[PDB]
Design an enzyme around this catalytic site. Structure first.
Site, PDB file in Angstrom:
ATOM      1  N   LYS B  26     -30.851  49.215  85.708  1.00 34.02           N
ATOM      2  CA  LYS B  26     -30.281  49.147  87.139  1.00 34.02           C
ATOM      3  C   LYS B  26     -30.673  47.955  87.752  1.00 34.02           C
ATOM      4  O   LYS B  26     -31.535  47.776  88.429  1.00 34.02           O
ATOM      5  CB  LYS B  26     -30.858  50.477  87.677  1.00 34.02           C
ATOM      6  CG  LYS B  26     -29.933  50.765  88.991  1.00 34.02           C
ATOM      7  CD  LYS B  26     -30.759  51.936  89.840  1.00 34.02           C
ATOM      8  CE  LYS B  26     -30.800  53.162  89.128  1.00 34.02           C
ATOM      9  NZ  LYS B  26     -31.325  54.375  90.067  1.00 34.02           N
ATOM     10  N   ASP B 113     -32.455  64.923  96.128  1.00 36.35           N
ATOM     11  CA  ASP B 113     -30.997  64.293  95.639  1.00 36.35           C
ATOM     12  C   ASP B 113     -30.675  65.141  94.235  1.00 36.35           C
ATOM     13  O   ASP B 113     -29.999  64.557  93.361  1.00 36.35           O
ATOM     14  CB  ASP B 113     -30.991  62.882  95.469  1.00 36.35           C
ATOM     15  CG  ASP B 113     -29.306  62.308  95.679  1.00 36.35           C
ATOM     16  OD1 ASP B 113     -28.788  62.826  96.566  1.00 36.35           O
ATOM     17  OD2 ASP B 113     -28.874  61.769  94.655  1.00 36.35           O
TER      18      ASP B 113
HETATM   19  C1  X4L Z   1     -31.731  56.160  84.921  1.00 41.43           C
HETATM   20  C2  X4L Z   1     -30.270  55.511  84.936  1.00 41.43           C
HETATM   21  C3  X4L Z   1     -30.508  54.105  85.241  1.00 41.43           C
HETATM   22  C4  X4L Z   1     -29.418  55.942  83.761  1.00 41.43           C
HETATM   23  C5  X4L Z   1     -29.883  56.069  82.484  1.00 41.43           C
HETATM   24  N1  X4L Z   1     -28.759  56.357  81.695  1.00 41.43           N
HETATM   25  N2  X4L Z   1     -27.605  56.255  82.320  1.00 41.43           N
HETATM   26  C6  X4L Z   1     -26.230  56.052  82.011  1.00 41.43           C
HETATM   27  N3  X4L Z   1     -25.836  56.331  80.786  1.00 41.43           N
HETATM   28  C7  X4L Z   1     -24.229  56.751  80.551  1.00 41.43           C
HETATM   29  C8  X4L Z   1     -23.823  57.884  81.057  1.00 41.43           C
HETATM   30  C9  X4L Z   1     -24.755  58.623  81.813  1.00 41.43           C
HETATM   31  C10 X4L Z   1     -24.502  60.059  82.308  1.00 41.43           C
HETATM   32  C11 X4L Z   1     -23.128  60.389  82.205  1.00 41.43           C
HETATM   33  C12 X4L Z   1     -22.099  59.576  81.828  1.00 41.43           C
HETATM   34  C13 X4L Z   1     -22.577  58.460  80.913  1.00 41.43           C
HETATM   35  C14 X4L Z   1     -25.220  55.615  83.031  1.00 41.43           C
HETATM   36  C15 X4L Z   1     -25.947  55.488  84.546  1.00 41.43           C
HETATM   37  N4  X4L Z   1     -24.676  55.048  85.150  1.00 41.43           N
HETATM   38  C16 X4L Z   1     -24.215  55.793  86.437  1.00 41.43           C
HETATM   39  C17 X4L Z   1     -23.299  54.896  87.071  1.00 41.43           C
HETATM   40  C18 X4L Z   1     -23.793  54.952  88.842  1.00 41.43           C
HETATM   41  N5  X4L Z   1     -25.260  55.258  88.790  1.00 41.43           N
HETATM   42  C19 X4L Z   1     -25.507  56.432  87.592  1.00 41.43           C
HETATM   43  N6  X4L Z   1     -27.077  55.348  84.467  1.00 41.43           N
HETATM   44  C20 X4L Z   1     -27.911  55.891  83.656  1.00 41.43           C
END
Ligand code: X4L
EC number: 2.7.11.22
Lengths: 279, 286, 65
Positions: B26, B113
């Site tokens: 991030k 949240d």
């Molecule tokens: C801890 C954090 C940095 C994180 C870890 N994994 N992850 C992923 N993985 C892929 C995914 C996860 C869930 C559903 C679909 C796909 C996506 C993602 N992006 C979002 C876009 C706006 N912020 C959140 N943030 C993360």
């Protein structure tokens, strides 16, 4: 919580020898860097310690007159930041004047003491362009300070443990009829404890208990039964002796502490400014 | 740098997330306060149901955080129409969420949240709370917070009435809303404003009185609503057993103090009853 | 499979902290500020502040670096 915190795991050290070793390593590494870049201009580690103490009290003074009023937790966090930074860094590379302000700034952010940058730098007794330059330097050094802290920003202070011990004394120790009269003096000792290296050598609970017990000893109330019975250390003699010698070491650290001298810090300040004139 | 960037994963108001080699990065106010919040909180926490902060770095006032890469989140699972959410799957998700929340509350931190997209799932079916940019430490008698926390559909009624001081109830109500979304596959209380959120809450659960909320009138933004009877819990959730209904009622109690904590929720009969929670490796992947 | 609740095993390296709901019974709450009606309305009780203060007072008291 402290018992699984980064402060306990990474920033509580076994002895003053370890701290002196870290500070001497920092000083010698800067000396090697400077001679590689290219001597009375260099500072000895004891001079670095004297300057760091002078600027820790400068940070205290800055935080004490800070409008809006700085919570005491923020001040403790900033002072711990300063100590931790200059454990592994030399004042001849990073000037303590900027580093203490960066510590206050980072602490205000970390302790959720929401303060805007303009009102932060307005507390500085400088010119408007002076305050602007100070803000520029603080923003330059904020990431450096965070990196040197190894991204360990939560600082466990002894103030909440002190309040908890006061609550416990008011509840479970009727022999001490009024723990409140132990407050100010203990707080005084707390401040003195904050001047030494105890924050890097002991737990905040131990520091708070030592301050309270020194306050009790000053008033003439000897209340070892609090440790023996209320905290049930009579069930563990080793733990009781360990606590007692930890507090005795605390008091020895406080008693042998030496405030920086005005002419000495004057000379060391000229030397530091000369070091920061060019490399 | 030390990380081989691989693939874009999303963008936010504070940072952008990309998958790299597997981790997810991030990436005059200085370093962003939300990033500092996440760093400072996740450095002091270590639990299998809390997202792990592996590394952090940056340059100048810009900073990046390194987390373990997660496969999915609860929002995608809920919105997936080909994913049948059996009672065991729901119990497993609820159990992991509540264990993470119990660890977090033990260390005196409110997530603030909680929502299906903030409950991430990895390839091993382990649910972790993430997005600690709003998380804050609670229990202090002077750290006055703001009531504009938690997404509206999951905001607790005490927050909607302007509660400054609050406890784990704000997370517990969000957990109840997440459970309701898991059961119904749609958001439980989808308001379009704070007033509409409160109206939906009182229409579904009945307007609370001083019997169920002794000091509701002391909240600064409290407004008297019309008295609704409230749809009974077994009407809303026709496929829920008595234990699950008891858990839902505990999570949706109007009194924040009477609202069940994470520890009390974990001790409830619903989690110890048949069937057992689905093992993480057997949870469905969208 | 079943599930069985097990309390979290976290070593505090200090004296035992009385449980939260026992604080009032044990006289602790008589030495902390009473929560205002708004505080209870939002869910904040004086027991929370008392318990946090005691937990910080006892955390790592017996720990040696
Ligand atoms: C801890 C954090 C940095 C994180 C870890 N994994 N992850 C992923 N993985 C892929 C995914 C996860 C869930 C559903 C679909 C796909 C996506 C993602 N992006 C979002 C876009 C706006 N912020 C959140 N943030 C993360």
């Amino acid at each position: 919580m402290y018992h699984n915190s980064s402060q306990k795991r990474h920033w509580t050290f076994s002895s003053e020898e370890q701290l002196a070793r870290l500070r001497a390593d920092a000083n010698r590494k800067f000396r090697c860097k400077a001679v590689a870049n290219g001597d009375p201009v260099f500072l000895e580690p004891h001079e670095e310690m004297t300057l760091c103490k002078y600027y820790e009290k400068r940070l205290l003074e800055f935080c004490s007159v800070f409008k809006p009023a700085m919570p005491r937790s923020v001040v403790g966090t900033a002072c711990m930041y300063f100590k931790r930074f200059y454990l592994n860094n030399s004042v001849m590379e990073y000037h303590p004047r900027i580093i203490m302000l960066t510590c206050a700034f980072l602490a205000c952010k970390v302790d959720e003491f929401n303060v805007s940058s303009p009102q932060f730098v307005g507390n500085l007794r400088e010119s408007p362009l002076g305050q602007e330059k100070a803000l520029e330097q603080i923003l330059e050094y904020e990431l450096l300070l965070i990196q040197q802290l190894n991204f360990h920003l939560i600082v466990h202070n002894p103030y909440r443990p002190f309040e908890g011990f006061l609550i416990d004394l008011k509840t479970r120790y009727p022999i001490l009829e009024n723990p409140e009269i132990l407050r100010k003096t203990a707080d005084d000792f707390l401040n003195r404890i904050a001047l030494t290296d105890a924050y890097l050598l002991y737990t905040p609970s131990q520091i708070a208990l030592t301050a309270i017990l020194s306050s009790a000893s000053r008033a003439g109330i000897t209340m070892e039964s609090y440790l023996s019975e209320s905290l049930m250390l009579k069930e563990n003699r080793t733990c009781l002796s360990q606590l007692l010698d930890i507090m005795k070491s605390m008091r020895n650290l406080v008693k042998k502490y030496e405030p920086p001298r005005s002419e000495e810090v004057a000379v060391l300040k000229q030397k530091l400014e000369r070091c920061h004139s060019a490399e | 740098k030390r990380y081989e960037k691989l693939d874009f994963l999303g963008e936010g108001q504070f940072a952008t997330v990309y998958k790299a080699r597997i981790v997810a990065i991030k990436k005059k106010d200085g370093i962003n306060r939300t990033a500092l919040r996440e760093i400072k909180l996740l450095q002091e926490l270590s639990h299998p149901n809390i997202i792990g902060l592996l590394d952090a770095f940056g340059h100048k006032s810009n900073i990046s955080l390194v987390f373990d890469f997660m496969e999915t989140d609860l929002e995608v699972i809920i919105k997936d129409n080909s994913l049948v959410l059996t009672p065991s799957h729901i119990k497993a998700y609820m159990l992991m969420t509540l264990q993470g929340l119990e660890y977090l509350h033990q260390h005196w931190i409110l997530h603030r949240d909680l929502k299906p997209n903030n409950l991430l799932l990895d390839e091993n079916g382990v649910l972790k709370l993430a997005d600690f940019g709003l998380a804050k430490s609670f229990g202090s008698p002077n750290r006055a917070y703001t009531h504009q926390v938690v997404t509206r559909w999951y905001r607790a009624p005490e927050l909607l009435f302007g509660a400054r001081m609050y406890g784990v109830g704000v997370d517990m109500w969000a957990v109840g809303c997440i459970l309701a979304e898991l059961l119904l596959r749609v958001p439980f209380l989808p308001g379009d404003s704070d007033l509409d959120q409160l109206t939906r809450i009182f229409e579904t659960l009945g307007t609370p009185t001083e019997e169920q909320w002794p000091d509701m009138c002391s909240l600064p933004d409290y407004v008297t609503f019309k008295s609704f009877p409230g749809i009974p819990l077994h009407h809303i959730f026709s496929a829920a057993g008595d234990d699950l209904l008891d858990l839902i009622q505990g999570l949706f109690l109007f009194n924040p103090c009477a609202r069940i904590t994470a520890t009390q929720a974990l001790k409830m009969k619903y989690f110890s009853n048949r069937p057992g929670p689905t093992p993480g490796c057997q949870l469905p992947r969208p | 499979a079943l599930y069985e609740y097990q309390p979290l095993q976290i070593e505090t390296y200090g004296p035992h902290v009385p449980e939260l709901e026992m604080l009032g019974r044990l006289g602790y709450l008589n030495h902390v500020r009473a929560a205002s009606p708004q505080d209870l309305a939002g869910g904040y009780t004086s027991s929370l502040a008392c318990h946090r203060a005691l937990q910080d007072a006892f955390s790592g008291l017996f720990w040696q670096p």
